[PDB]
Every structure is written in structure tokens, then in C-alpha cells.
């Protein structure tokens, strides 16, 4: 029946340990989501399980929306996107709980 779609937020500040990824996130920040998709929080007993699904669903949605427009993500984009989305999913879980 579809998923819950969180409110847009400022893309998070993340100090990536890989220096090149750290720079790449800043250079290309607008490529990544600023909103997450999820199943309702009360369907989970813990944060980690929620976040796991929230990351998978959000990355799936974002990649599908992008590919159908004839655009592409790099391998670096995917690594950064997963981290960005994980942080926003954690935020969403803590906020919505
Ligand atoms: Cl932003
Ligand atoms: Na480093
Ligand atoms: Na594509």
C-alpha cells in the first residue's frame, strides 16, 4: 500500500573517513535524497531493523526515479547515498518515535 514519506530535511553534515568520498559528498550533495521512505515505526522493535528497511526502500526509490529520467549514479554516489540515507533514517526513527 506504499510507504510513509518523511518530511524533507537539510542533507546531513557527514565527515566521511574516506577523504575522496568526503569531498565528493560536498561537491555532489544535491544528487542524494533529502527525504526518506519507510514502513511505519510501530512495525519495528528496534532502530537497526527500521533503518535497514528505510535505507533499502529509500535507495530503491531514489535509484528508480533517477534511472527512468535517463540519469545515472556512480559507484561513489551509491556509497555516499547509503550513508546519507542511513543518517536520515536514524533521524526519522528518533523523531517519529
Ligand atoms: Cl540540502
Ligand atoms: Na581519511
Ligand atoms: Na541509470
Residues 6+ apart with CB under 8 A from 10: 34
Cα diameter, the chain: 41
**Experimental technique of record:** X-ray
Centroid of ligand 1 to alpha carbon of 86 (angstroms): 15
What the block records as the C-alpha cell of 6 is: 518523511
What the block records as the C-alpha cell of 73 is: 549514479
What DSSP element (H or E) covers 66? helix 47-67
Q: Of 33, 30, 85, which is closest to residue 56 (Cα–Cα)?
A: 85
> Is the distance from CB of 57 to CB of 3 less than 8 angstroms?
yes
CA 65 to chain centre: 14
Centroid of ligand 2 to alpha carbon of 85 (angstroms): 21
Q: Residue 20 and residue 42: Cα distance in Å, rounded?
A: 38
Entry resolution (Å):
1.5
What DSSP element (H or E) covers 24? helix 19-27
**Which ligand is closest in space to the CA of residue 16?**
2
What the block records as the C-alpha cell of 3 is: 510507504
Amino acid at each position: 500500500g506504499g510507504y510513509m514519506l518523511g518530511s524533507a530535511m537539510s542533507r546531513p553534515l557527514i565527515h566521511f573517513g574516506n577523504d575522496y568520498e568526503d569531498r565528493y559528498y560536498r561537491e555532489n550533495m544535491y544528487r542524494y535524497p533529502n527525504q526518506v521512505y519507510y514502513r511505519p515505526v510501530d512495525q519495528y522493535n528496534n532502530q537497526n531493523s527500521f533503518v535497514h528497511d528505510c535505507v533499502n526502500i529509500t535507495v530503491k526509490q531514489h535509484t528508480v526515479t533517477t534511472t527512468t529520467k535517463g540519469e545515472n549514479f556512480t559507484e561513489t554516489d551509491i556509497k555516499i547515498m547509503e550513508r546519507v540515507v542511513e543518517q536520515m533514517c536514524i533521524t526519522q526513527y528518533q523523531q517519529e518515535s
